[PDB]
Structures are given as C-alpha cells and as structure tokens.
Write a protein that binds this ligand. Sequence first.
Ligand SMILES: *[C@@H]1O[C@H](CO)[C@@H](O[C@@H]2O[C@H](CO)[C@@H](O[C@@H]3O[C@H](CO)[C@@H](O)[C@H](O[C@H]4O[C@H](CO)[C@@H](O)[C@H](O)[C@@H]4O)[C@@H]3O)[C@H](O)[C@H]2NC(C)=O)[C@H](O)[C@H]1NC(C)=O
Ligand SMILES: *[C@@H]1O[C@H](CO)[C@@H](O[C@@H]2O[C@H](CO)[C@@H](O[C@@H]3O[C@H](CO)[C@@H](O)[C@H](O[C@H]4O[C@H](CO)[C@@H](O)[C@H](O)[C@@H]4O)[C@@H]3O)[C@H](O)[C@H]2NC(C)=O)[C@H](O)[C@H]1NC(C)=O
Ligand SMILES: *[C@@H]1O[C@H](CO)[C@@H](O[C@@H]2O[C@H](CO)[C@@H](O)[C@H](O)[C@H]2NC(C)=O)[C@H](O)[C@H]1NC(C)=O
Ligand SMILES: *[C@@H]1O[C@H](CO)[C@@H](O[C@@H]2O[C@H](CO)[C@@H](O)[C@H](O)[C@H]2NC(C)=O)[C@H](O)[C@H]1NC(C)=O
Ligand SMILES: *[C@@H]1O[C@H](CO)[C@@H](O)[C@H](O)[C@H]1NC(C)=O
Ligand SMILES: *[C@@H]1O[C@H](CO)[C@@H](O)[C@H](O)[C@H]1NC(C)=O
Ligand SMILES: *[C@@H]1O[C@H](CO)[C@@H](O)[C@H](O)[C@H]1NC(C)=O
Ligand SMILES: *[C@@H]1O[C@H](CO)[C@@H](O)[C@H](O)[C@H]1NC(C)=O
Lengths: 574, 574
Amino acid sequence: QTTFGPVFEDQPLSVLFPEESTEEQVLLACRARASPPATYRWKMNGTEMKLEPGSRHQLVGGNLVIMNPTKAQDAGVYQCLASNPVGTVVSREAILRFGFLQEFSKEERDPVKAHEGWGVMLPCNPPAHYPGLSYRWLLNEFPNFIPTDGRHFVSQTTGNLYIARTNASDLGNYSCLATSHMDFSTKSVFSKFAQLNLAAEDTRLFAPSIKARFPAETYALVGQQVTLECFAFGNPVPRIKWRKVDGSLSPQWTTAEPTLQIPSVSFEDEGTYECEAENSKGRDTVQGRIIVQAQPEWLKVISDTEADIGSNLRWGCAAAGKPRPTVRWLRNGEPLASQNRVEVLAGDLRFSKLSLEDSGMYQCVAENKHGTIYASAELAVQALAPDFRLNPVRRLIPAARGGEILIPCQPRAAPKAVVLWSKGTEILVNSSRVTVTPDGTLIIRNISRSDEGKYTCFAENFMGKANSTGILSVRDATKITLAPSSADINLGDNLTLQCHASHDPTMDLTFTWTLDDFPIDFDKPGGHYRRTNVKETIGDLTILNAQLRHGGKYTCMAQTVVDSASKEATVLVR
Amino acid sequence: QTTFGPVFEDQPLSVLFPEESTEEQVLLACRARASPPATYRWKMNGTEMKLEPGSRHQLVGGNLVIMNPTKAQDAGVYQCLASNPVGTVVSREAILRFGFLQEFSKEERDPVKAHEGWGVMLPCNPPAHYPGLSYRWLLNEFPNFIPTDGRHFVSQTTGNLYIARTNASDLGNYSCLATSHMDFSTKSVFSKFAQLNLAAEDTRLFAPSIKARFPAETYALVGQQVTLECFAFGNPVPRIKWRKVDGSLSPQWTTAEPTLQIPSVSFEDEGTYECEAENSKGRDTVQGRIIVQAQPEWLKVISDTEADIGSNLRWGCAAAGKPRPTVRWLRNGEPLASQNRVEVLAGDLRFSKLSLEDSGMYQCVAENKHGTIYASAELAVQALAPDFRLNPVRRLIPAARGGEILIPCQPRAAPKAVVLWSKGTEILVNSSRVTVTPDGTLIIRNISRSDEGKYTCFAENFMGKANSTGILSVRDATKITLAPSSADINLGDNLTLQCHASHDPTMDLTFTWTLDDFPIDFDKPGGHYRRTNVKETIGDLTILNAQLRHGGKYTCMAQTVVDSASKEATVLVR
Ligand SMILES: *[C@@H]1O[C@H](CO)[C@@H](O[C@@H]2O[C@H](CO)[C@@H](O[C@@H]3O[C@H](CO)[C@@H](O)[C@H](O[C@H]4O[C@H](CO)[C@@H](O)[C@H](O)[C@@H]4O)[C@@H]3O)[C@H](O)[C@H]2NC(C)=O)[C@H](O)[C@H]1NC(C)=O
Ligand SMILES: *[C@@H]1O[C@H](CO)[C@@H](O[C@@H]2O[C@H](CO)[C@@H](O[C@@H]3O[C@H](CO)[C@@H](O)[C@H](O[C@H]4O[C@H](CO)[C@@H](O)[C@H](O)[C@@H]4O)[C@@H]3O)[C@H](O)[C@H]2NC(C)=O)[C@H](O)[C@H]1NC(C)=O
Ligand SMILES: *[C@@H]1O[C@H](CO)[C@@H](O[C@@H]2O[C@H](CO)[C@@H](O)[C@H](O)[C@H]2NC(C)=O)[C@H](O)[C@H]1NC(C)=O
Ligand SMILES: *[C@@H]1O[C@H](CO)[C@@H](O[C@@H]2O[C@H](CO)[C@@H](O)[C@H](O)[C@H]2NC(C)=O)[C@H](O)[C@H]1NC(C)=O
Ligand SMILES: *[C@@H]1O[C@H](CO)[C@@H](O)[C@H](O)[C@H]1NC(C)=O
Ligand SMILES: *[C@@H]1O[C@H](CO)[C@@H](O)[C@H](O)[C@H]1NC(C)=O
Ligand SMILES: *[C@@H]1O[C@H](CO)[C@@H](O)[C@H](O)[C@H]1NC(C)=O
Ligand SMILES: *[C@@H]1O[C@H](CO)[C@@H](O)[C@H](O)[C@H]1NC(C)=O
C-alpha cells in the first residue's frame, strides 16, 4: 500500500579480476525490494555514470555488467543507488581490483664477491606484482632446488638469501624465482643468474648478529595470521628462541623455528615479543610489538517510524571498533546537516515540530579507517481528521443531586482539535458553576433538577470536524442517618451494631460491613456475624461468640448501583 | 464495510384514530440504518402478518399503511422487525386505538320522588365512550344552563347531580348531556328528561353527611394531574377543608373548594389526605391515600463489542422504576435462555470460550406494569493469523559474557500460537542451560563465545504461520576493580575517593558518582566536587570545601552503552 521504502537485499561485493585471464565480463549485483519498484543508478568514483546504450557498461535488472574489463579504464569503487517515489537509499561500496605478475628485468645480475667463512647477501628484487607471491631460489641447473636447511634462509617478505657460512660447495650462479598463487591461474617467473665467487678462506666461531628482524610495530586485524621472522649470522648454527615480555606463549607456538606463526589473532596477543639468537659464542635479542584492531560493528540502530504532525522525535546510533568510529547522517542519499527543525549531534537526531515534509528514507553511517557500515530507516508523518469511534462521550451520565460531574471529550486527531461544548442549542461559556478546562473536560458543580438534557461536544481542526452527544439525568443521593458505636467485650460475647440509610425511591440499596477494611462474610457456615433487623433501610449486625480477630475498625456502607456512603466504629475483644 | 447491524432510527408510535372521521388511512413508521440495507416485517398481536399485494395493509419503505381503518379488524398492537445478514432487531410496540361516542339510550327516565328540604339523587348513566367526557346538566329548556352554585354539584367522574337542598324552584324536568373533547371533532349527546316532583317539607338544620368521596387508594404516575372530589349534604351550605395528615399543603392548593386539584405530581405528594365538611350543626371527615409510581428508565446499557475466538465476555443491564422492572435477553429477535456456553442470570450475560457462532445482534429488555424499554448491541468474533509487524524480535541482542539473556516472542494472533525456537537450522530442545518457557521467551544462562549467531522463532496456529529472526553477539563485561572508603571530615575540608574499572577494548566507559542515590554535578559553577586522576579507567573525585549536605552514601558507577557496575562508600561531615 505504497508504504515501501526501497529496502535493500543484495549489495555489491569487491572483486579481484585476474589479468591475462580467459574471461570477458564482470557482474556487480544490486537488488532492492520496493512498492512501487525502484530504479537504479550507479556511481563510479563518485560521479554519476551516464549509462548509454550497450557500449561496454550495461544494466541488467539493477546489476552492472562491464564488457571487456581492463585495468586502464575499469578499476575503481562502485556504488548503487535505489530510488523510489518515497525516497532513495545508497548501498555499500564495491572495489574492483586487477591481478597480475609482470616479467623480470632482463639486465644481468652483478657478481657478488664473497670471502669463504663469512655470510653473504643475495637479494632478488622481485618485480611488480599483486598480491604477494611465494619466493624460492635456484642454483646452477633448471630446475634444481636449493636445500632448506639451517645453513640458509629465504624470507618470504623480501626474498633475499641468508647464507650463514660460505664454503667450497657455494660456488655457482644463483637465480631467484617468484610464484603467484591465485584462485584461477598460477604463474612462475625466473630471474637471471648471479655468479658468486669466493676468496681466500677465513673461518672463526663468532657471536650471532641478527640481520632479518620483525618490525617494532605490527598492526593486525582480529582474525588474521601473523608471521614474525628472525635470523642471525652465527658459526656454529645458532638457535632461535621466541618469548613474550608481558606473558607466556601458547604451547602450540612455543617452538624454536626462526619464524613464529600465529594462525588466528585475538586481543590477547597484543603486546611485546622477543626473538633471541643463542650459541656457544654469543647471543643477540630483538624486541617488537603487536597491536590488534577491528572494524566497526553496530550496537543500536534505527527502525521504521510513523508519527503525527506537530510532535517531536529522537533517533540514535551506536557503533564499536578499536579505532573509534564516527557517525553521520544521510537523507535521501544526501548528507544531512543541522538546519531549521532538524538537529544532528554526533550520532543523535532530533525533530522538533514535525511537519509533513520530514517524511522519507533516512540513513546512518558509521566509519573508521578499516571500513564503513550503513543502516536504513523510514519516517512517515500522518495527518488525521477528528474521530470519536474509539472514545465517544458517555451516552448515560447518572449524576446524584447536589454533586459534581466531569465529562471528558478527547477525539483521535492529528494535530489536536479545538473542542466546544453545548447544551441543546445554547453555547456554554463557562462561569463559576460550569467550567470548561482547556483539555475539553466539562465540569458542573452544584447540580440540580434543571441541568438534565442533552449535551454535545464539537471537535474541529484544519482537517475535519466531528461531534458527540450524551444524556444527563438527576437522581437523589444516598445518605447514612445513623452510625454505630464503639464497644469492648470478651472472647465469646455477643454485640449489636446499627446502621440506617436513605436513598432514591426507584433504586435498590444494599448494606455491606467491613472489618478493618476487610469485607465481613455472613454466608460463612458457623459464622460469627449475623444480619439483624433486616429492612429496606435497617441492616444491623450482631457478633455472636466473639473472637480475638474480630477486634478492629468496623465500617458500614450503604451502596446503590450508582453511589455509596459509609460510617465507622470500633470494637475491642479480650 | 459490512459492519452494520440494523440500527434503529424511527420506531412506531401509538395512535388514537377517531371514529366517524373523514380520513382514510393511517401510517406506522419504521426506519433502520444498515449496510447492506435491511428488510422489514410487521407483527400484529404477535402473529407475523402475510403482507399480500395491495389489499388493505401495504408496505411503503418500511412504513405500514392500513386502508379504510375500522375498529372491527384493525385495532391492536404492532411491532416491526428489521433484519440483515448480520442479524435482526425488534422495535418497540405501537398500539392503535379507536375513539367514539355512542348515542344515549332512548327509554324514558324514571320520575324521582323528592321530599322538599332534603337532598336528592339525579344520575345520568353515561353511554359507552372513549375517552372520558365532560358532563353538564340541563333543566326545562334547550339550551338552558343550571347554575353552578354551592347548592348544586356535578361531579366529573359519575356525573350525578347533588341537590343539597330542595325547594319550590326545583320543580321541572332534568336532562344530562355529555361532551366529547378530542383533537379533531367535538360531539354532544343529550339525554331524555326526568321530571322531578316534590312532596311536603320540614324546617330545621342538620349535620352534613358526605356522599361523594375520593377513593382510599389512588395510583398516579409522575407527571399527571390528580383531582380529588368531595361533597356532603348540609343545611346551611357547609364548607369543605382539605388537609394532609403527614404534612402540609402548598399555598396554591390550600383552598376550600370541594375539588382539590394537583396539576403535576411528584414523589412528595404520596401520602394521606383528609376532606372535612363543616357547618354550624356538624362536621364529617374522610381520609384517603395517594400512591405515586413511575415507568422504567435505563441506568446502564450494553454497547458494540469485538472479541477474539477463545476468550470470555461479560455484559450487564440496569433499570429503575418504582415497581421494580425485570430484565430479559433477546438474540436475533428470539428469547435467549441459558444453554451451553452462554449463561444468563437476572440481567447479566456471560460468554465462556467464545466461538465464531456467537456473533450477532443482542438485545436487552426491561419491563414492568407501566411499560417496557429496549437496548441493542452487536457482538463480533474475529480470528487472526500470526503477525510480527507490531512486536518483532529484537534485531540486535548485545549480551555480556557469562550472563543471562531472555528473548520473548509474542505475535499478534487469535487464538494463541504455538511457538518454536531454533538456532540456525537446529531445533532447540530445552535443558539446564537453555530454557524455553511456555510463554515462548527463550532464556540462556552462562553465555560463552559459542552462542553467537542467528536465532529464529516460528509461530503457528490453525490460521497461519509466521516467523522472526534476531542476531546475538557476545562482548566482555564491565568490572569495578577498586572501591572507595568511608571517611569523616569537618565542614570545609577536602577529601579524595578513588574508583577503578575495566571494560571491553572496543567500547567507551564513563564514571558517574551519586550522593544518596542523587547524581553529583561536576559542571556546577562554584561546585565542591572535582574530577581527579581522569584516565580511561580512573575516575577519582575530590570534595573541596565540604558542607553538611555532602555527608551521605557515595556511589561510584562505571557504565558503558550496554551494562554498568557500581560500588558504595560513606562520608560524614561535621
Ligand atoms: C453533530 O452530528 C453530525 C456528525 O456526528 C454532524 O454532521 C451531520 O450528520 C451526519 C453525520 O453522520 C452527516 O452525514 C449524514 O449522515 C446521516 C446518517 O448518518 C444521513 O441521514 C445524511 O443524509 C444526507 O445526505 C446528503 C449527502 O450526505 C445530504 O446532502 C443531505 O442533506 C442529507 O442530510 C448525511 O449522510 C450530515 O451531512 C451532517 N449534517 C447534517 C445537516 O445532518 C451534525 O451536523 C452535528 N450537529 C450540529 C448541530 O452541528
Ligand atoms: C521464515 O520466513 C518466512 C516468514 O517470515 C517464511 O516464508 C518464506 O518467505 C516469504 C515470507 O515473506 C514467503 O514469501 C516470499 O516473499 C519473498 C519476499 O518477501 C519473495 O522473494 C518470495 O517469492 C516467491 O514467489 C512465489 C510465490 O510467492 C514462490 O512460489 C517462489 O518460490 C518465491 O519463493 C515469496 O513471495 C515465502 O514464500 C516463504 N517460503 C520460502 C521458501 O521462502 C520462511 O519459509 C521461514 N523460513 C523457514 C526456514 O521456515
Ligand atoms: C474556563 O474557566 C477558566 C476559569 O476557571 C478559564 O481559565 C482557565 O482555567 C484553567 C484551569 O486549569 C487554567 O488552565 C487557566 O487558569 C485558564 N486557561 C486558559 C487557557 O486561559 C478558562 O479560560 C475558561 N475556558 C474557556 C473560556 O474556554
Ligand atoms: C523447558 O524446561 C522446563 C523445566 O525447567 C520444562 O518444564 C516447564 O517449566 C515451566 C517453567 O515455568 C513450568 O510452566 C512447568 O514446570 C513446565 N511447563 C510445562 C508446560 O510442562 C518445559 O516444559 C521446557 N520447555 C519445553 C519442553 O518446551
Ligand atoms: C577511479 O578510482 C581509481 C582508484 O581510486 C583510480 O585508480 C582511477 O584512476 C579512477 N578513475 C577512473 C577509473 O577513470
Ligand atoms: C447548591 O445549590 C443550591 C441551590 O439549588 C444552594 O442553595 C446550595 O448552597 C448550593 N451548594 C453549595 C455548597 O453552595
Ligand atoms: C388484536 O389485539 C386486540 C387487542 O388485544 C384485540 O382486540 C383484537 O381482537 C386482536 N385481533 C385482531 C385485531 O385481529
Ligand atoms: C560458565 O561457563 C564456563 C564455561 O563456559 C564454566 O567454566 C563456568 O563454570 C560456568 N559458570 C558457572 C557458575 O558454573
């Protein structure tokens, strides 16, 4: 019933298109549920695209289809806007990134001079790539495989060889290679040879000197695997120990391998770590830190709301992320700034004197360095004509003579309706005796046998007019013309109390007695209370075989179907 | 929208059709508002009429028209029934009565012998009539007029002459006449002559003897004029005094005329009256009573009601009349008796386990000897499929670690819906840790990092099925790792209190201090409270220039957007 903001059900997702692939198209999906159905626009780097006919970019039911994707003119960030007569909404981002691995530079590698017994550096300066590759080293023949012993180390972050000790077998020509691991294809690129030569021998057992070290500060989101690498020059082969300064490591990680690995990281891993190289000739240690961060997550969002013209509203948001997020507001896909009767403050939204214009689709955005999140809601403002169906004025208003009466008149209206009372055809301007409160309730005091008749309440606003009618009748009031008396007796004695009343001739009158505000039962078998002198106006009560519990404050009450009256006395029982 | 019982707006009215008139038709009106429009039937003495084509009785839009009305076959009591697919209603009665005045009997009146100086009786036995007539007497000539002095009296309830004293001028022949006073026509009927003759006489004065007296018991509704007549035989002309035994008469009625009149009667006139004839030779007095009564009137009626299948209902009625009325119930124009799940008792109606069949038009009838009154209402029973629009399950359910959570699931259904919970795709059979109450609320104790996910509630009844979904997430809980200490100081001293807390790394934590559960202000200019050691986990407070009012129980509370914790201490100031 045209009460459908363009709610989202499928927002686009980031893609990594491999280069030199065998595909021809990519799809970015956008799906909205709306009534009437919504229309879609696509933003690329912010500027609204001009989706011409089927030249490259095309629209298929809200999904974006690019043709012949290439990094030259298709890599970017894409957004989808779903618009309706009610309002518009904006979806989350979708990044399209390409993947490739170029060819190694063709110039010859310089020959590194070495002296037998020391350590040497063999870098292999990997070419441009995306994403990170896996590195290996080759010697002499293709394909051989350099052994992965404790004498050599090949880091996976720079790839340089770490030849701890140099001897005769190290003569040859070293080449690097890189392997790209992707979902679709795998590529391997080899490097030109670098012939290493060794000078005269010089061997002495020396203290380790740490060369490959993990950086002091290492940021890592919660859920990622972290690998800290460590290596030192030492003869004989040193041993590497990993420890935590402000804690202890899990037994699954208490290993002496030169690369400490954490498969999953939570907030308990944040702290300081120490890598120590140890041998019979020395020891060298290096410290560093690990910091854990997280993306924002919602804690409290907004929801759909229908209000009425003239009222006020309050809306809120709340997020949670390790670098604290910031919250901002959107109206129909546009930034919302504090103006007029809309007040925004750091994630709370206030509407004062809500109007008809304030209806639409609102959005809440929480952002930090690691990501952004969205939430949507709809505000609808309603105007209503006066209606008395739910709360009509009482049809029958029996009022005792010489008393006060109050008749409220509150129709269901939006905004509030002006209320005017009348009796018959005359219009009531209030006086000392008749009063008309601003709320519309009409109160009459000092009632008599001349106020009976038909009363009408008229409610009007700029939307409509309604009206209701009641009938007022007057009767005589109840009276108590005799009150009982206090007494003191012994347990097991009999006492009598009297109570007389007068009432209107046309109604029924009943007598009820309470003991300390507790109604006294007379139909109880073996009961100690008996009605006596039972007439239309006489309702005496006799206590037979009095007990301790019968002491207290007795209260006689004469009640009709309309009103009541009461009198009090007390009895003590020993 | 087919929610219209045949409400009444014009019910028939009693008529008095004068005989020997010049009219040819009568109309009895019946009007009902209904949607769809209602159909009408007419009852005459109770049997449903067979309204044939236009032979005498005819129907015009719900109104009844009889043709050539005559007392022979048209005088009765008429009722109108308005029927709809929703239900039927029955209107109040309407009595049709004729009015006429026949011709006086043609036989000669007997000659009444009289003895001069006495009193004589001259009745005139009025013929059949409706309604009561006005009586007058004629003597000798037509038209003469006998004087209305104190010597003669002509009562209006029997019409007989009361000649107090008889003398020579009383010789003649007396005739009666009756005049019928109606709205349309006036008719006068004269009677044959009765020749009165007089014998010898005497000469003396005697005591009065009352002859025409008012009856001892006289019933009179509220609003009617009551006339009590009195006369006695007395020479000379006696005087009549009217008094009240248990009260005093109004000055407008304290008159000595031989007919006491009350234009309007209220309940204060009920009692005993005395008429006294007085003269120089004697006095005779006669007593009687006046009893005042009233017709039933409503005090509390029923109204339209929509309920749901499976519930219970209570309805009531109340009337007021001097002869106490009796209340009975009608369903669709038929008497309602206590059967099955409907219980009737002396004006209260109880529905137990309301079904779909109990929908329709109900009516309440209050009756006594002086009249009857009706009231109408409609009962509608609704069945509803489950719906979660008004009360959906919470979308975000942040739960602290190691605590308890409760999630209710109450859809809008009629009757109640069976509720089954599930996590993901598994079905939860409830145990020590997880409990599913009969109301549907699911409670989990001892929450860990294994309970997060998506929870679903399925509600089903014989009308339909619906479901709702929520998301559960777990976070660390707040703590207070340091509590303050009690102290005693003098007015004007400075005191420091400490309070430390721990919380989840991704949320904000704030400290608030209260004095005897009243929040302590820190931004108050010239305030005595200053925040100190303000860190993320340290929120100390210092009292500067302490006053008497600063003594009491301090409470430090560390709170987040989700949960909170608190600790207490006390300070005394002299
Ligand atoms: C106090 O009462 C009413 C509102 O509660 C207010 O308006 C009048 O009465 C009804 C409101 O229900 C208006 O509509 C009428 O409804 C009745 C039955 O529900 C019908 O009989 C009426 O028939 C009219 O049909 C034509 C088109 O509507 C009219 O042109 C024609 O004249 C008939 O009246 C009608 O549907 C109704 O129109 C108004 N006005 C009148 C004059 O009745 C009412 O005026 C309030 N009283 C006062 C003194 O202000
Ligand atoms: C828990 O969720 C729902 C109840 O809330 C329950 O019913 C299923 O989902 C929707 C409920 O809104 C049913 O109606 C669907 O609505 C969505 C969008 O609102 C549409 O995409 C669906 O399209 C259907 O259209 C045809 C005619 O309706 C179908 O024949 C066709 O197969 C499409 O599904 C449809 O209008 C929906 O029918 C049901 N059922 C299913 C299978 O979705 C849902 O089953 C509950 N889940 C569980 C596990 O019990
Ligand atoms: C009715 O009479 C009162 C005086 O008793 C007028 O004054 C109002 O009284 C209400 C009672 O609570 C208060 O709100 C104010 O003292 C008055 N209200 C306003 C709006 O002035 C009142 O104005 C009279 N109503 C009319 C004339 O419609
Ligand atoms: C859930 O476990 C409880 C036991 O703790 C089962 O017993 C019900 O517990 C409620 C709790 O107030 C009580 O009404 C009764 O003791 C039991 N109710 C009924 C209808 O038997 C309960 O049945 C379990 N829920 C299930 C099985 O759905
Ligand atoms: C779009 O954005 C990307 C990344 O910010 C940028 O590389 C590119 O040059 C932009 N413009 C295009 C694709 O036309
Ligand atoms: C109520 O009205 C009557 C007049 O009808 C008057 O005599 C009486 O004093 C009024 N009540 C009060 C409390 O003034
Ligand atoms: C109808 O009722 C009246 C009054 O009770 C009665 O006089 C008459 O005979 C009845 N039958 C008719 C009018 O056919
Ligand atoms: C709460 O659960 C944990 C494990 O999740 C358990 O070790 C602990 O004892 C439980 N609490 C209580 C009070 O048993």
